Amino acid sequence: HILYACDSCGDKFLDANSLAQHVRIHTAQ
Numbered sequence: 001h002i003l004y005a006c007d008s009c010g011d012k013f014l015d016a017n018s019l020a021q022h023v024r025i026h027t028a029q
């Protein structure tokens with residue numbers, strides 16, 4: 001379930017792989 005979260009934007013991921021890559025999409029364009 002909600003194991004990982006992208007802070008600042010408050011994104012709630014059930015995936016870790018998608019979470020971490022999501023914090024990547026923030027560094028990227």
Ligand SMILES: [Zn+2]
Nearest residue numbers: 006009010011
């Ligand atoms: Zn985010």
